[PDB]
């Protein structure tokens, strides 16, 4: 490449492995949103909650895919594994599987960051500064948030909660 | 002081006095606000209604600091102690708290205005009456309808209430 | 906590000790400017000065909660040391302090900063980054300059330099 | 009269008589105007501040005047004393006459105040509260700064200081 500089073969790995993660909860996200349009469901403010996610998570390996393209990388595509539920019970339980997918996509990050410090790459440690570590915070501050309040909203009056959290709450 | 008439050592070191409980007040609502605001607390509403607090107890000490050096006064300025709380329970016991802070900052108030009357000083008084002695009713009678309107939210599904409360009268 | 990731006990801790020392210079810069607005001091671009110091470092504390919140970590205040002068000499003088406040600042931002890059805490060294460092830097700077004029206008015609200084150089 | 009602004699008596003492202010300032626009003086802000005061003091007697009319008091003037000096100095010297005058005005509204409390008359309280209390406190802590600010520019080079005073400071 005539481009490439200061851009370890490992990085350009991790970053096609990162895009393929990317890929992955993109489509989880897809899953869960349209789990909560059916009719049996039938959450419209959880299932617009999640496809904005499956919108977000698109941005970031299109935005991965970007850098790869501009530090001289090049771009190897995975299958993309299907999500690991088909069907995604309460809200309660699908912001838990939502907040256990960001966790991962925030180690991930985090991971290739220490490997990209290791590799002494700035570029790569500013990048990943600007674009992600702050929106993962962010994200994950907002489902801790959401799941403390449907923890509170809980009990014997229980399907009751949900539909308030979805109604007062989340847009619609 | 040139400028200084009518304006006793005792009221003067009792706006000093006064300012520190501002101070303190101040402290404390950042210290609601802040709490309203964790993962595990999440109560945006009611964050938002003590953060406010901290800024309208900030203007009060503002304006007897300018007052203060209207006189001929000079400000000195105490340590501020820590808040009585770290942890500040659910809505109900934060607002029982903010209601006994109120009750001792209008005692405060009440006191300095005693005084002041009895240096007949009717700048003073007139001072206290014009920014601060409206002000705190207002506060209070608020905190009384909050403090009525969760008591009615209490009880079995009390989670519940919380939750709506901060959805349905707190601004967010 | 159900958000916490990545996000060392000794920062979260270093983090309410910066806290404590931002509110602590936020009530430094309270004091400054309260005192250059006395009868007897009687500059009131010096005082506007101070008093945005005041909201500046407010604006930090605010935000050093903000995420502290964000990470997970739990806000601990301790009371807040009262400032290291009742009177704050000239304008040189109180500048010269103003300056030694923002070194130690920046120090303890700096230190935190090693701290966060030893824990391998990206977040925290971008967050600090984007948000302190450059603010700081800057702030210093103009400090300087201000120093360097005030020294300029000194000697035996030295109380008419502290007026155009304050009309001419600050905004008022 | 048909509309009087606790409105003492005493009271009247001494709303006259402040009125006096507000006509014979708005005339010293009125001397004090012309006197900063001679050719041998030439001070246009000094003028414009003391032309500004001469206006402040008559909306004074005014109010003192509207207000005897609506308690049913009868307003009697007497003769209006000559301002006490023909030449009034330089700015500190004249600056300095303004603030004995304007602790004068202070100290007959406060004795007004005395004797309506005493008279029990709490619309006269609040009348004075209202309109002059708060203006006076205001008036003497502008002239404070102003003296300070001649004092700081005093000294050897003190033609120079007067000059700049005017010109950043006064408004022109």
Request: with cysteine.
């Amino acid at each position: 490449s005539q481009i490439r500089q200061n851009y370890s073969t490992d990085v350009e790995a991790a970053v096609n492995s990162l895009v393929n993660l990317y890929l992955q909860a993109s489509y989880t996200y897809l899953s869960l949103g349209f789990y909560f349009d059916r009719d049996d469901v039938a959450l419209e403010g959880v299932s617009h909650f999640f496809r904005e996610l499956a919108a977000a998570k698109r941005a970031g390996y299109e935005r991965l895919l970007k850098m790869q393209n501009q530090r001289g990388g090049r771009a190897l595509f995975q299958d993309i594994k299907k999500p690991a539920e088909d069907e995604w019970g309460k809200t309660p339980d699908a912001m838990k599987a939502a907040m256990a997918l960001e966790k991962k996509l925030n180690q991930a990050l985090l991971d290739l960051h220490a490997l990209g410090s290791a590799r002494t790459d700035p570029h790569l440690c500013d990048f990943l500064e600007t674009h992600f570590l702050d929106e993962e915070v962010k994200l994950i501050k907002k489902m801790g948030d959401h799941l403390t309040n449907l923890h509170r909203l809980g009990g014997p009056e229980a399907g009751l909660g949900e539909y308030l959290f979805e109604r007062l709450t989340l847009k619609h």
